Amino acid sequence: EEKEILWNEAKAFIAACYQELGKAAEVKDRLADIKSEIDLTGSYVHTKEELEHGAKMAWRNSNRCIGRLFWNSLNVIDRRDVRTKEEVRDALFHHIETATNNGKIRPTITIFPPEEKGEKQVEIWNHQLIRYAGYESDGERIGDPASCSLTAACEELGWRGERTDFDLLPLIFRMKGDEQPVWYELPRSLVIEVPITHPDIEAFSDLELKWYGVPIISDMKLEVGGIHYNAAPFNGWYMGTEIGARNLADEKRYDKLKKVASVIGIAADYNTDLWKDQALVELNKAVLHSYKKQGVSIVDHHTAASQFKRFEEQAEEAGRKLTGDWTWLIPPISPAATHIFHRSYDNSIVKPNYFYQDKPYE
Amino acid sequence: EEKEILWNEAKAFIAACYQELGKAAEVKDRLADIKSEIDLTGSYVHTKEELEHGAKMAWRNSNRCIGRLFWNSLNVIDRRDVRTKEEVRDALFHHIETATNNGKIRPTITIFPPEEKGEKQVEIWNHQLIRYAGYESDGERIGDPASCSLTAACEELGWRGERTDFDLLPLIFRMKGDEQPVWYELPRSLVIEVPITHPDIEAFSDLELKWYGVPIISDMKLEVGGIHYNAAPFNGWYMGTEIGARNLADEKRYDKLKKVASVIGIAADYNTDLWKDQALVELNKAVLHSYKKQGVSIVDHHTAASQFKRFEEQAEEAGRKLTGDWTWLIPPISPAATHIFHRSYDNSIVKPNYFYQDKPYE
Ligand code: HEM
Ligand code: HEM
Numbered sequence: 001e002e003k004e005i006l007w008n009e010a011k012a013f014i015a016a017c018y019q020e021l022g023k024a025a026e027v028k029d030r031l032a033d034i035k036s037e038i039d040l041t042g043s044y045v046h047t048k049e050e051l052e053h054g055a056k057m058a059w060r061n062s063n064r065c066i067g068r069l070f071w072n073s074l075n076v077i078d079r080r081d082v083r084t085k086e087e088v089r090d091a092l093f094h095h096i097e098t099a100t101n102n103g104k105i106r107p108t109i110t111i112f113p114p115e116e117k118g119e120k121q122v123e124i125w126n127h128q129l130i131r132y133a134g135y136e137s138d139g140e141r142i143g144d145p146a147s148c149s150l151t152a153a154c155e156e157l158g159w160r161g162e163r164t165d166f167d168l169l170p171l172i173f174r175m176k177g178d179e180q181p182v183w184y185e186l187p188r189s190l191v192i193e194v195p196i197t198h199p200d201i202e203a204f205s206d207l208e209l210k211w212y213g214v215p216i217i218s219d220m221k222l223e224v225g226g227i228h229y230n231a232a233p234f235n236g237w238y239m240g241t242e243i244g245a246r247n248l249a250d251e252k253r254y255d256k257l258k259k260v261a262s263v264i265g266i267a268a269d270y271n272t273d274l275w276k277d278q279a280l281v282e283l284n285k286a287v288l289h290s291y292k293k294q295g296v297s298i299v300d301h302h303t304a305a306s307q308f309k310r311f312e313e314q315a316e317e318a319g320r321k322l323t324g325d326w327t328w329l330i331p332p333i334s335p336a337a338t339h340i341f342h343r344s345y346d347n348s349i350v351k352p353n354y355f356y357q358d359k360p361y362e
Numbered sequence: 363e364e365k366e367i368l369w370n371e372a373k374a375f376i377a378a379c380y381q382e383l384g385k386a387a388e389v390k391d392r393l394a395d396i397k398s399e400i401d402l403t404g405s406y407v408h409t410k411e412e413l414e415h416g417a418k419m420a421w422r423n424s425n426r427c428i429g430r431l432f433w434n435s436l437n438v439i440d441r442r443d444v445r446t447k448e449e450v451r452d453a454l455f456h457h458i459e460t461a462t463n464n465g466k467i468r469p470t471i472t473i474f475p476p477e478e479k480g481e482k483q484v485e486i487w488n489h490q491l492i493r494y495a496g497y498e499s500d501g502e503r504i505g506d507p508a509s510c511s512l513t514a515a516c517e518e519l520g521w522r523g524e525r526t527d528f529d530l531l532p533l534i535f536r537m538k539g540d541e542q543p544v545w546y547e548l549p550r551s552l553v554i555e556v557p558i559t560h561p562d563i564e565a566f567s568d569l570e571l572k573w574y575g576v577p578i579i580s581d582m583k584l585e586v587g588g589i590h591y592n593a594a595p596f597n598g599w600y601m602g603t604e605i606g607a608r609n610l611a612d613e614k615r616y617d618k619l620k621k622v623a624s625v626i627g628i629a630a631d632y633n634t635d636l637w638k639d640q641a642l643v644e645l646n647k648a649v650l651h652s653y654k655k656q657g658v659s660i661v662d663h664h665t666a667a668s669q670f671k672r673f674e675e676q677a678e679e680a681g682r683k684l685t686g687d688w689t690w691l692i693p694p695i696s697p698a699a700t701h702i703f704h705r706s707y708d709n710s711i712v713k714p715n716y717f718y719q720d721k722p723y724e
């Protein structure tokens with residue numbers, strides 16, 4: 001079964017990819033080459049053109065992503081050549097530096113060797129390459145609760161966090177043939193952070209909030225033409241609501257709304273005062289203001305939805321079916337102010353795509 | 363087929379209804395009575411207890427409704443006895459008066475004779491019993507755009523609106539055997555309206571906004587045990603977002619956000635200022651403040667979601683499956699501040715329930 005799945009996925013991908021690239025005449029010969037390679041080796045190897053366009057297609061097919069207008073300008077870094085943990089580490093450091101680009105963020109993906117027999121060559125433990133640690137013990141909660149389990153796993157490996165609310169987790173990953181992952185501290189010169197201030201409310205800095213510049217998802221699997229790239233970190237720039245309406249606001253995250261209410265001078269006592277809603281808006285204005293002031297790329301949810309409308313229009317014009325997950329595409333503040341809220345989306349899964357995979361801790 | 367559907371729905375409803383009412387021992391005899399009645403007459407007649415509990419079950423099964431905690435206290439008015447248009451009119455006037463209850467709104471449903479051969483006895487044209495007219499001609503838009511088609515239909519029947527932004531539509535309904543519906547102007551003493559003011563911003567009254575106190579849906583079909591009550595208007599009280607985030611805010615409704623921004627003293631020029639979000643919050647605070655000040659029932663979305671959590675807990679305790687439509691249950695502002703956003707719901711249809719039906723105009 002394994003090989004037949006691979007071959008069937010390969011045929012569908014190569015045909016579609018080569019059609020998009022105006023290489024339709026080359027499909028026949030390429031598939032023959034591929035089928036012999038599968039027969040002889042159990043797998044096949046993407047050309048650089050296939051890998052690049054495959055990763056772009058995977059972004060285009062990501063139902064939960066509002067940012068897809070820009071799918072075709074993804075910067076694809078081919079690191080299928082790495083073999084050592086030093087090479088992986090340096091590749092991850094490089095992704096951070098080149099994606100950050102001094103604040104003018106470049107959407108980028110770095111692609112490591114794919115699974116072989118379902119056997120991973122490189123197993124990345126981080127959820128994002130840059131993320132804050134979380135701690136909970138004896139009533140005391142510090143940092144990002146979402147990171148508690150990974151943080152505890154890191155501390156099992158000899159790492160120790162300073163226990164501020166914003167400790168940077170080290171990179172942590174395992175190589176094929178190694179029993180334990182290795183970890184490496186992030187050089188702070190590589191990591192841009194943004195302090196959160198408000199355009200009109202001076203007291204907002206009293207909250208001492210900050211967030212990191214670049215979200216780099218590192219625990220999803222890129223699947224292209226039946227090949228499983230379990231290690232392929234990718235990043236865009238933030239939409240402000242991700243930080244202001246979720247990371248800093250969720251009760252199970254940094255839970256800052258009551259503190260926000262206090263510094264903006266409103267009571268947090270009555271549901272009918274809509275103090276949570278007002279606090280959310282001011283916190284979200286502050287996040288956008290702060291990123292802009294520092295010269296770090298960010299998009300607000302109105303502009304993002306307008307871009308996504310253009311993506312829908314572009315799909316129709318190209319004669320491609322549009323797929324999407326309405327429940328993720330609507331922004332978590334003022335969703336009915338966006339066109340997304342007022343239409344529906346087909347949530348079918350189309351490949352190439354990015355997929356969740358089981359965590360190696362937990 | 364028709365009769366078999368009826369009988370099958372009847373069996374399921376009577377069994378479930380009588381179990382809930384502790385009348386399980388009476389099911390057998392009641393079903394026999396019902397089957398003979400179907401055989402002899404083509405249909406059957408609900409007891410008052412069945413009709414009342416049926417309407418309550420229908421509310422409990424309404425997937426899109428956040429207000430279901432209170433399903434068991436629905437006030438059910440049995441008007442299966444009406445035969446004349448004067449009786450229907452007076453029944454609708456009475457529903458308005460008793461549901462309004464001087465502002466302390468009583469959730470109420472008035473149930474008219476059901477369809478016979480799929481032949482309606484009473485056909486209500488209004489979407490809600492109280493709603494504003496809408497006009498559009500030669501570039502000029504007045505009132506509620508959602509009402510344009512019904513307004514035009516009314517004006518075909520000899521009615522004429524004053525063309526303010528808040529003209530009350532007349533009641534309009536058709537009797538079996540009549541070719542045209544009749545219409546009746548609403549007595550203004552029956553209709554409570556609330557002027558929108560803001561707790562801290564005096565200029566907000568310059569917008570001259572108002573809304574009606576009681577939302578009374580009058581175009582849905584109540585289905586109970588295979589019987590089709592196409593005419594059965596029902597009401598609760600408003601959740602504030604329905605008015606502040608949708609009726610007054612949608613671009614295809616009253617479209618007031620730019621005007622709100624101006625009176626609250628903020629620029630409406632840059633998406634990154636989140637002026638739409640800020641305007642939405644202030645407009646929504648104003649709606650809640652105004653209803654409360656006037657002594658007209660209303661609920662905010664935080665309190666409503668908390669009540670809905672209790673409804674979920676109550677269902678589990680009673681051993682009933684919970685059904686819901688996530689896309690309608692989340693409020694249109696700060697949805698991620700509610701527990702609803704963070705879980706999923708089975709959107710299966712369970713009967714008794716309320717259903718859409720084709721409009722007789724359009
Ligand atoms: C260029 C800027 C980008 C923006 C503004 C953007 C925006 C977003 C947002 C707001 C989400 C929702 C995430 C959440 O609530 O947790 C999301 C999800 C996602 N985005 Fe994008 N995105 C961008 C670039 C990218 C890129 C470059 C890729 C891949 C190559 C990507 C793939 C995805 C995927 C797979 C998800 C779903 C993640 C999950 O299921 O947990 N996005 N995006
Ligand atoms: C007691 C106060 C109530 C509150 C606060 C409430 C709240 C709501 C809200 C916010 C919606 C969404 C409507 C929209 O966005 O257009 C809704 C929908 C609905 N509610 Fe309730 N509701 C209440 C009472 C009732 C009652 C008494 C019934 C029936 C007996 C009912 C049946 C429904 C139905 C059928 C819908 C869906 C309407 C549609 O599909 O267009 N509700 N409710």
Ligand SMILES: Cc1cc(N)nc(COC[C@H](CN)OCc2cc(C)cc(N)n2)c1
Pocket residue numbers: 146215216217234235236237238239242
């Ligand atoms: C590539 C990218 C760009 C962008 N602006 N945002 C994203 C999404 O960031 C990661 C996103 C959190 N906002 O992850 C979604 C998620 C969250 C959680 C709690 C679990 C999970 N499995 N997946 C990705």
Ligand SMILES: Cc1cc(N)nc(COC[C@H](CN)OCc2cc(C)cc(N)n2)c1
Pocket residue numbers: 508577578579596597598599600601604
């Ligand atoms: C009974 C009730 C109580 C309450 N608070 N809200 C409601 C819902 O009010 C009517 C609701 C508009 N908010 O109707 C939903 C709808 C809207 C539109 C534009 C079309 C349609 N078919 N159905 C009903």
Ligand SMILES: C[C@H](O)[C@H](O)[C@H]1CNc2nc(N)[nH]c(=O)c2N1
Pocket residue numbers: 341342343344689690691
């Ligand atoms: C297309 C989409 O389902 C549509 O905008 C829905 C979304 N959720 C909603 N939720 C409520 N309560 N009311 C609505 O009118 C809508 N509209």
Ligand SMILES: C[C@H](O)[C@H](O)[C@H]1CNc2nc(N)[nH]c(=O)c2N1
Pocket residue numbers: 327328329703704705706
């Ligand atoms: C249960 C529900 O699907 C869950 O809250 C989803 C809703 N939509 C979302 N949308 C985004 N963008 N991100 C999320 O984490 C979630 N969470």
Ligand SMILES: [Cl-]
Pocket residue numbers: 215242247
């Ligand atoms: Cl994030």
Ligand SMILES: [Cl-]
Pocket residue numbers: 577604609
């Ligand atoms: Cl309404």
